[PDB]
């Protein structure tokens, strides 16, 4: 009875690099405001 | 400097959680 709608998900290396950069730069930006 | 000491944990989870999410998705990609 397995579900026919399951799909595999992907994230390529370039997307990891872009995504990590986004997170790190957001952290470097907002961290000053979090410490205040 | 009299900073907000909840800022360390907010900054740390802000980085860790979404970064872990990306890493998990990327690695399971490279192994299929």
């Amino acid at each position: 009875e397995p579900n026919p709608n399951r799909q595999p998900v992907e994230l390529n290396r370039t997307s990891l690099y872009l995504g990590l950069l986004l997170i790190l730069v957001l952290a470097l930006l907002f961290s000053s405001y979090f410490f205040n | 400097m009299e900073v907000n000491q909840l800022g360390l944990i907010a900054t740390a989870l802000f980085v860790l959680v979404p970064s872990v999410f990306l890493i998990i998705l990327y690695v399971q990609t490279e192994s299929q």
Partner: peptide, 30 residues
């Protein structure tokens, strides 16, 4: 603690730069 934190994040970005250049997905001509 706040100084350490800013420097840590900056340091991670510099390491990201290194991998994104030297350990990129190489472009090929499909």
């Amino acid at each position: 603690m706040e100084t350490i934190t800013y420097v840590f994040i900056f340091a991670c970005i510099i390491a990201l730069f290194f991998f994104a250049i030297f350990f990129r997905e190489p472009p090929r001509i499909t």
